[PDB]
């Protein structure tokens, strides 16, 4: 439901083929928040419960509203936490295909983490979905150092965080349909394009 620590809890001797690392939005609960459980259930339907590990970014990522105003749209401590989870996935399960996602501050966190990641681990992330991407205008709809064909951004018309503001208006809270359908569809397509483990 809102807390999933499948990578931290998982046995290295029985690695999943696909590991999904997700960062929630500001003030959201657990480590998956409101959109992460919907994506997780559809990934489990596609790959099976034993085939995919879902891992939320918890620990030092507090998802504090005020940190949206920091230079990279989140805190340095939060970036260190998500970088550490990508490094743990790479170490624990070197043949797993990775996929990533984030909502709002969590989408800025996923973009900052992927930009800073060692290239050999970044290149294993077959697809990344970003909802309400707070650095959408600034980064021109891209994640630095990461290919456009592996990125999908969901930015609603009238969600002001997609157009360079930090104001929260009603379209920012309307990504439920996307998390239920097109975002898992994109992630499953990008994993099957390369394959699994």
Third-level CATH fold of 1-197: Rossmann fold (3.40.50)
- In what side-by-side order are the strands of the sheet with 52-56? 52-56, 18-23, 97-103, 125-131, 151-154
CA atoms of 159 and 155, how far apart (whole Å):
7
Domain ranges of the chain: 1-197
Resolution of the model in angstroms? 2.5
CA atoms of 56 and 79, how far apart (whole Å):
13
- Structural determination approach: X-ray
Q: 192: exposed, middle or buried (C-beta count within 10 Å: 0-12, 13-18, 19+)?
A: middle
């Amino acid at each position: 439901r809102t807390t999933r620590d499948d990578l931290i809890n998982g046995n290295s001797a029985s690695c999943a083929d696909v590991i999904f690392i997700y960062a929630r939005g500001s003030t959201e609960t657990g480590n998956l928040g409101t959109l992460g459980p919907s994506i997780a259930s559809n990934l489990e339907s596609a790959f099976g419960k034993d085939g995919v590990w879902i891992q939320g970014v918890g620990g030092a990522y507090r998802a504090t509203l005020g940190d949206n105003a920091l230079p990279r749209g989140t805190s340095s401590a939060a970036i260190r936490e998500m970088l550490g989870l990508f490094q743990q996935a790479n170490t624990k399960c070197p043949d797993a295909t990775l996929i990533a996602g984030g909502y709002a501050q969590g989408a800025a966190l996923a973009a900052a983490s992927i930009e800073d990641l060692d290239s050999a681990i970044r290149d294993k992330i077959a697809g990344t979905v970003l909802f309400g991407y707070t650095k959408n205008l600034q980064n021109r709809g891209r994640i630095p150092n990461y290919p456009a064909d592996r990125t999908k951004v969901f930015c609603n018309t009238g969600d002001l965080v997609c157009t360079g503001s930090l104001i929260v208006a009603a379209p920012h809270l309307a990504y439920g349909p996307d998390a239920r359908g097109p975002a898992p569809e994109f992630l499953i397509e990008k994993v099957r394009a390369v394959r699994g483990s």
